[PDB]
Scaffold this active site. Structure first.
Site, PDB file in Angstrom:
ATOM      1  CE  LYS A 264     -13.542   6.163   0.217  1.00  0.00           C
ATOM      2  NZ  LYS A 264     -13.231   6.423   1.067  1.00  0.00           N
TER       3      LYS A 264
ATOM      4  CE  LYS B 284      -5.830  13.127  -0.329  1.00  0.00           C
ATOM      5  NZ  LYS B 284      -7.010  12.678  -1.397  1.00  0.00           N
ATOM      6  NE  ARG B 285      -4.522  10.298   9.398  1.00  0.00           N
ATOM      7  CZ  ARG B 285      -4.634   9.817  10.080  1.00  0.00           C
ATOM      8  NH1 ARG B 285      -5.809   8.742  10.883  1.00  0.00           N
ATOM      9  NH2 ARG B 285      -3.679  10.128  10.815  1.00  0.00           N
TER      10      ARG B 285
ATOM     11  CG  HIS C 268      -2.155  -0.963   1.555  1.00  0.00           C
ATOM     12  ND1 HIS C 268      -3.639  -0.913   0.502  1.00  0.00           N
ATOM     13  CD2 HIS C 268      -2.128  -1.715   1.454  1.00  0.00           C
ATOM     14  CE1 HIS C 268      -3.294  -1.955   0.936  1.00  0.00           C
ATOM     15  NE2 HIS C 268      -3.202  -3.391   0.947  1.00  0.00           N
TER      16      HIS C 268
ATOM     17  CE  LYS D  33      -2.437  10.294   2.491  1.00  0.00           C
ATOM     18  NZ  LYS D  33      -4.067  10.109   1.318  1.00  0.00           N
TER      19      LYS D  33
ATOM     20  CB  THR E  78     -10.659   4.692  -1.608  1.00  0.00           C
ATOM     21  OG1 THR E  78      -9.248   5.367  -1.065  1.00  0.00           O
ATOM     22  CG2 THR E  78      -9.231   3.404  -2.267  1.00  0.00           C
TER      23      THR E  78
HETATM   24  O1  LIG Z   1      -4.552   1.287  -1.167  1.00  0.00           O
HETATM   25  C1  LIG Z   1      -5.108   2.174  -0.381  1.00  0.00           C
HETATM   26  C2  LIG Z   1      -4.641   2.806   0.337  1.00  0.00           C
HETATM   27  O2  LIG Z   1      -3.485   2.796   0.837  1.00  0.00           O
HETATM   28  C3  LIG Z   1      -3.034   4.045   1.974  1.00  0.00           C
HETATM   29  N1  LIG Z   1      -2.043   2.993   1.982  1.00  0.00           N
HETATM   30  C4  LIG Z   1      -1.588   3.587   3.824  1.00  0.00           C
HETATM   31  S1  LIG Z   1      -3.131   4.164   4.719  1.00  0.00           S
HETATM   32  N2  LIG Z   1      -1.028   3.051   4.165  1.00  0.00           N
HETATM   33  N3  LIG Z   1      -0.967   3.018   5.478  1.00  0.00           N
HETATM   34  C5  LIG Z   1      -0.083   2.218   6.173  1.00  0.00           C
HETATM   35  C6  LIG Z   1       0.207   2.444   7.080  1.00  0.00           C
HETATM   36  C7  LIG Z   1      -0.646   2.121   7.985  1.00  0.00           C
HETATM   37  C8  LIG Z   1      -0.736   2.517   9.397  1.00  0.00           C
HETATM   38  C9  LIG Z   1       0.890   1.928  10.479  1.00  0.00           C
HETATM   39  C10 LIG Z   1       1.818   1.785   8.951  1.00  0.00           C
HETATM   40 BR1  LIG Z   1       3.815   2.067   9.734  1.00  0.00          BR
HETATM   41  C11 LIG Z   1       1.435   2.291   7.891  1.00  0.00           C
HETATM   42  C12 LIG Z   1      -2.684   4.285   0.363  1.00  0.00           C
HETATM   43  O3  LIG Z   1      -1.429   5.656   0.849  1.00  0.00           O
HETATM   44  C13 LIG Z   1      -3.336   5.101  -0.522  1.00  0.00           C
HETATM   45  O4  LIG Z   1      -2.471   5.463  -1.457  1.00  0.00           O
HETATM   46  C14 LIG Z   1      -4.030   3.526  -1.216  1.00  0.00           C
HETATM   47  O5  LIG Z   1      -5.204   4.231  -2.079  1.00  0.00           O
END
Ligand SMILES: OC[C@H]1O[C@@H](NC(=S)N/N=C/c2cccc(Br)c2)[C@H](O)[C@@H](O)[C@@H]1O
Ligand SMILES: OC[C@H]1O[C@@H](NC(=S)N/N=C/c2cccc(Br)c2)[C@H](O)[C@@H](O)[C@@H]1O
Ligand SMILES: OC[C@H]1O[C@@H](NC(=S)N/N=C/c2cccc(Br)c2)[C@H](O)[C@@H](O)[C@@H]1O
Ligand SMILES: OC[C@H]1O[C@@H](NC(=S)N/N=C/c2cccc(Br)c2)[C@H](O)[C@@H](O)[C@@H]1O
Lengths: 810, 810
Positions: free
Chosen positions: B654, B542-543, B351, B548, B650
């Site tokens: 939406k 978004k976060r 991811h 971003k 994502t």
């Molecule tokens: O595929 C779904 C989405 O996933 C997101 N990845 C995210 S929330 N990773 N979190 C990684 C993470 C979370 C917690 C701790 C740690 Br250490 C890493 C991507 O940034 C988006 O581009 C994508 O659309």
């Protein structure tokens, strides 16, 4: 099957069956192919509790409409036990549910064994609160039980190598169907902080907030459609608590620890901060609830006409300065008026005379935790001592004796002195106990205000303690005198005219034998232990303490054993000697006593010469559900506390009601029991209170008894030499040391007369007909000891309210 | 009211009404005179969930009968949001419940606002898991979501003085009706201990035990009567834990802290022991459940034919050595066979490419916490490196690059290298992301095993993200093309033939206006903020992260403001600029960015010259329920990550589905979206990935842009001088410093082209008809981005299973 369990009608059984299947499906999300007995229990529990809702809603509705005087029973302990069977009994559903479950292919008794005890108490004090709630509902009183929802109740006792082990009582593990969370009535409770003085009075500021979340449990009256409430508070952190981030969330535990665990010390005092927090938590949350309800009826003069607060011992004693705090600081009443209101509202019940059991909180704890309450206490003390000074001018020692503040190494607050000062009534729990209060520990207070002092002899509920646990006995009584005695236990007197009735004698004796057979089978199944059901069932069950003298019982057991080894081919009445009860985790001596009992059993139960003539069993994990089993099976009830030490006892009453005879001292409620049955129908022995006093003045010398009683000497030498502990020869040196040199409870002084009296028990048991006739005279006179009588006396003489046996519309 | 919400039949409404009143009475113990809206919500929730039980029991029954290949989706995050409306939608109950509640005198929408979000995730990764479960049920797959039941989910964000404050998300406070506790399936999980070697293999001994208690939540498919399960584990101490006595009971908290709180870091890595415990806890409990279910179907050769395990990122990567552990140590399979089984069973989804987000656990942590798993990892590494050596002889640097063990200051395990080694498939989440994996960070692994590498472009569920949150839009589409598109989103293409339809254009534009009106009212009511609903709704939600580029958005906002102050009497298209999202608690820069946004709003929103032409709003506490409101109201979607940094996104999908146009870079799924709609129907700007690479080789010099763009210079000088922080002149020195000297994400490099492209947005919005026609071309081409498509691709290309749109009998 039996009459007293109600009707099993066609529409009822059918409706119960369909609601059972509805709950299994919709509530538990199971089908009949995946369900375990636990699921079946839960489906039943849900089916039964559905029957409470309508009655519960309208009972509470009714109190809002009619607005009667409210009774608030404040306790840190409610020892409830199981709830399923008790609900069915009070709702007349038992036979109907038995039939419905039978037709579904299930055994209801098997399902009842699945329910956990609500073990939110230690012993007599906690179980008294439970019996009281039942009687208050049965008598139509607008009463509320207020306490704490401990996440962990009294520990489960495991016996390992003859030693007690404790494990957490995780009673909420599978969820509690008998509670309704009420998060909408959450209340804040304040701790720490500081006192600020302003033009308009004191203010308590900079406090830490803990939230109190109430859980309501229904308390059904006996077939009167009354359902009262027991409200238990749970501790929750507020959402900004500590708010690196992770730790702040994890530290929420600190606040929530307040309601985590029941303190397992009975009749002993430990000044721990967490325990003080529990006491304030329950008091502060309860009082806001009380005041809120009162305002939903400005004028606090009418407060005592609409509210009574009963303090179950000194544990909720902070109610007194807390009520003052709210009235003075928040409502702005003047001191004198606030105090008048407080005194007329509060009443205090004392449950012990043991000095080490009295609550004396260090001043520095109250200083930090509750700074405003300390100030109010000092002010109460000052004004009370001025009254004393004025009544007894120049009596300077009386002043220091009566002070709420105790001087010394550390300054302490005597919570019992606080209670007497701030209550319109103070009561003991049996006539002898109440007299001892007036003559010794509270003599000074009795002289100042004789009118405050009363007696309220304890009782037990005949619903749980006869109908529920001994259906067989309840039925044979009902056949002769009807069912009305269940809520009017004095009617049992009518059984006196059946003492020469040969059919009744046979029936009484048969019920006992079946109870003994059932229990002897229980022991074999759940504990793999073999006993002769023909023997006399000699039972002592209660918390382990030195004053209760389980040790005297031990000495008798060893005497019988030694007499058998002496004359093996002589005849003796066979006995099964059963002793059970939990020891407080830090009470070393009590734990050694348990070890001794098991060690005697190891020797006795495997001596081929003894055979099945003597058996010594330690009953593990004694608790309400176990009491309901062992008590109906007992022939002999051991109530052998040193005279003057057992405030009342209630175990004693349970045995009397269920057809056992009593061996005991003239202590606590034993006195009144023997008085009711006639002393000829009781096995009384040992020193009376006066004899104990004489011995103390003179000085108790155990050696004297050791020197003059060869049978006692033999026992001591066996304990010392390692007869009962071959691998660890000196294992019991502490017990011998204590007996010989440091025995506060004078075990040796009663030995001779106890052994003698025990011979007389054996003698009577040889004559089945005469044993059973004396039994009938006991049951027939046990009516006084119903908690319905006790509660009616509280109502009329303390709370100022009239009990009512009238039904609410169904 | 509207068609897509199902039938409101006479028998249905009547039955719903009576079951509602039954639950209010029997379940909640209330009457209509005491009930609050919360009680009403709960009565409804219970009434609806009753409809799931039959389907749930038979779905699970069906999988036992037919025994299909099982899919296990392992995630530490499931960002579910609210469940009531989603259940009604998938069960066709929405209109019926609306009617039933209306007739009871209640507004259903008001009741829906009472439900708490299940916020058991951070952002995109967690919400992906939630959409996936929905699609798996809709497609008839035998799938289970496995995770942790956090007591506290993502924190609630409060904005205080422009600063983010965090508070605990106590989402279980009032109880969760959407879960069924399953304490009968409690499983033990082991920690610490040591490894003993014997004749018959290694043994893991002297461990600490934590219990895992499962909670099942139903996952209903769309109108197919399929109900799948999401099983979440809760941590419980065993009953002999620590078992002075009081403390032993209180220390139970330590064990139970495992499931207490969700870690709020996304796209960043923190090597905390508690987080490692969470990862093992979920993996160990889930795998025993998997194996148990498999044995209830000796022969593990068939394991991969009956089981697929999907690893959602590396967080449950311990599944690989844990499966090996069980197979080798407990089942006694040989290494090679165990490994063959493991590889064919597991698959890994990546991811992110951000280096600081990769999990690299210190060896000394694994050493102490999981000694056996470390040993297995070393063994995996050895055997993998021998394979590399054999394929690329003499390439010594490849060996150190590919090693699971990273040497250095502290030794670490690269969990991503572990995943690739132990999985038969590795996939990225958009085509460009998947290519970047093959070309850069996993290049070496791709060269060794090209066949493992796949793409699975992300999707969103059209149930939650169209039908549920935008009923108006779903209805006007249904009127023209029918309802079948809801579970077959490709059908939206048929809308292309309506792009010149004047009625449709008017309807599309009307739906948007009503969504904007509704949201503008929400802001005024729940947050007391005034906005012009005629303005263009410019939203970035978004976060908060630097990649971003919320900061680029900030710079544009300041540009518009400065241009207005320059030429106040010139015409500009009015905008409402909305930015929302949470910052990770320890991410200082992200918190400063939030502060900047609010600080710009303080200046802009109170400048009289601006009027209602420009408004800057920070949307507090952004979360799933807020997304469902703001997304249907948006005109412009900001997707402006630096090219190569957003794996997929994502949020972007939406907005596309709900009638907003997109301004964005050629990053993540934006590329495929623009490809589907045609680049002419998208506002693309900025560097592509290749341009970024060129700039890095050359060296990024922010100064160059500062020197050559006077409008950019002005902004920097305003930030520096304290224009946006008059009382604290240097408040934003860190942001300026970072932009000028330490900007990893090249904000200045895209500024010009972004501002320019934003002018083109303003231009098109001046022409309502042409704006709306482009919108129609976006919605019409958004079919590819349904998670039904994504899941069907996973099923066929990774798991080896056929999706099915066939109904189970009702
Ligand atoms: O595929 C779904 C989405 O996933 C997101 N990845 C995210 S929330 N990773 N979190 C990684 C993470 C979370 C917690 C701790 C740690 Br250490 C890493 C991507 O940034 C988006 O581009 C994508 O659309
Ligand atoms: O055990 C599962 C849960 O049950 C819940 N009871 C609920 S939802 N209705 N009860 C209704 C009701 C009706 C009649 C009598 C009683 Br008595 C309760 C409790 O609130 C929870 O604390 C508990 O954990
Ligand atoms: O009146 C009911 C019964 O009460 C019992 N009292 C008990 S359990 N006090 N516990 C006091 C206690 C408990 C916890 C902590 C501390 Br610090 C003291 C009496 O001993 C019985 O004689 C009597 O029948
Ligand atoms: O919120 C109150 C409590 O509810 C309980 N649910 C119970 S008793 N039946 N559910 C049945 C059921 C039926 C269909 C779907 C679902 Br989804 C659950 C849960 O076990 C508790 O964790 C929870 O705290």
């Amino acid at each position: 099957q039996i009459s007293v369990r109600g009707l099993a009608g066609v529409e009822n059984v059918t409706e119960l069956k369909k609601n059972f299947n509805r709950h299994l499906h919709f509530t538990l999300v199971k089908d009949r192919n995946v369900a375990t007995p636990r699921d079946y229990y839960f489906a039943l529990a849900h089916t039964v509790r559905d029957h409470l809702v309508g009655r519960w809603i309208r009972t509470q509705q009714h109190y809002y409409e009619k607005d009667p005087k409210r009774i608030y029973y404040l306790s840190l302990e409610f020892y409830m036990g199981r709830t399923l069977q008790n609900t069915m009994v009070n709702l007349a559903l038992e036979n109907a549910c038995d039939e419905a479950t039978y037709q579904l292919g299930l055994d209801m008794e098997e399902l009842e064994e699945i329910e956990e005890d609500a073990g939110l108490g230690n012993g007599g004090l906690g179980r008294l609160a439970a019996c009281f709630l039942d009687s208050m509902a049965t008598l139509g009183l607008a009463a509320y039980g207020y306490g704490i929802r401990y996440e962990f109740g009294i520990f489960n006792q495991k016996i390992c190598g003859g030693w007690q082990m404790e494990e957490a009582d995780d009673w909420l593990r599978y969820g509690n169907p008998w509670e309704k969370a009420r998060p909408e009535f959450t209340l804040p409770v304040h701790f720490y902080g500081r006192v600020e003085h302003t033009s308009q009075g004191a203010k308590w500021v900079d406090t830490q907030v803990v939230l109190a979340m109430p859980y309501d449990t229904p308390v059904p009256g006996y077939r009167n459609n009354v359902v009262n409430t027991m409200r238990l508070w749970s501790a929750k952190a507020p959402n900004d608590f500590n708010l690196g981030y992770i730790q702040a969330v994890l530290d929420r535990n600190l606040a929530e620890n307040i309601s985590r665990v029941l303190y397992p010390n009975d009749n002993f005092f430990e000044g721990k901060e967490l325990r003080l927090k529990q006491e304030y938590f329950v008091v502060a949350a309860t009082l806001q609830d009380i005041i809120r309800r009162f305002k939903s009826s400005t004028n606090f003069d009418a407060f005592p006409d609409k509210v009574a607060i009963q303090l179950n011992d000194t544990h909720p004693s902070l109610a007194i300065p807390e009520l003052m705090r709210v009235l003075v600081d928040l409502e702005r009443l003047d001191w004198d008026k606030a105090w008048e209101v407080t005194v007329k509202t509060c009443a205090y019940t004392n449950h012990t005379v043991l000095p080490e059991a009295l609550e004396r909180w260090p001043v520095h704890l109250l200083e930090t935790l509750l700074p405003r309450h300390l100030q109010i206490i000092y002010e109460i003390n000052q004004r009370f001592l001025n009254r004393v000074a004025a009544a007894f001018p120049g009596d300077v020692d009386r002043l220091r004796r009566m002070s709420l503040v105790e001087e010394g190494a550390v300054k302490r607050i005597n919570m019992a002195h606080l209670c007497i000062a701030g209550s319109h009534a103070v009561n003991g729990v049996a006539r002898i106990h109440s007299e001892i209060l007036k003559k010794t520990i509270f003599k000074d207070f009795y002289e100042l205000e004789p009118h405050k002092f009363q007696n309220k002899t304890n009782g037990i509920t005949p619903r749980r303690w006869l109908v529920l646990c001994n259906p067989g006995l309840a039925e044979i009584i009902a056949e002769r005198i009807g069912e009305e005695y269940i809520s009017d236990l004095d009617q049992l007197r009518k059984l006196l005219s059946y003492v020469d009735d040969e059919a009744f004698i046979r029936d009484v004796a048969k019920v006992k034998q079946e109870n003994k057979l059932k229990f002897a089978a229980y022991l074999e199944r759940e504990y793999k232990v073999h006993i002769n059901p023909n023997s006399l069932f000699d039972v002592q069950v209660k918390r382990i303490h030195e004053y209760k003298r389980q040790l005297l019982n031990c000495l008798h057991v060893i005497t019988l054993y030694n007499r058998i080894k002496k004359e093996p081919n002589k005849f003796v009445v066979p006995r099964t000697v059963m002793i059970g009860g939990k020891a407080a985790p830090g009470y070393h001596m009590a734990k050694m006593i348990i070890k001794l009992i098991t060690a005697i059993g190891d020797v006795v139960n495997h001596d081929p010469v003894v055979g099945d003539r003597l058996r010594v069993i330690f009953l593990e994990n004694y608790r309400v559900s176990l009491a309901e089993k062992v008590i109906p099976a007992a022939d002999l009830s051991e109530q052998i506390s040193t005279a003057g030490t057992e405030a009342s006892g209630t175990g004693n009453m349970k045995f009397m009601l269920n057809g056992a005879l009593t061996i005991g001292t003239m202590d606590g409620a034993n006195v009144e029991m023997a008085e009711e049955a006639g002393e000829e129908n009781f096995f009384i022995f040992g020193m009376r209170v006066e004899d104990v006093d004489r011995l103390d003045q003179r000085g108790y010398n155990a050696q004297e008894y050791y020197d003059r009683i060869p049978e006692l000497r033999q026992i001591i030498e066996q304990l010392s030499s390692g007869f009962f502990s071959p691998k660890q020869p000196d294992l019991f040196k502490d017990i011998v040391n204590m007996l010989m040199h440091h025995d506060r409870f004078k075990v040796f002084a009663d030995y001779e007369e106890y052994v003698k009296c025990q011979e007389r028990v054996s003698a009577l048991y040889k004559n089945p007909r005469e044993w059973t006739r004396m039994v009938i005279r006991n049951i027939a006179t046990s009516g006084k000891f119903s908690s319905d009588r006790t509660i009616a006396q509280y109502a009329r003489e303390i709370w100022g309210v009239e009990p009512s046996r009238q039904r609410l519309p169904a």
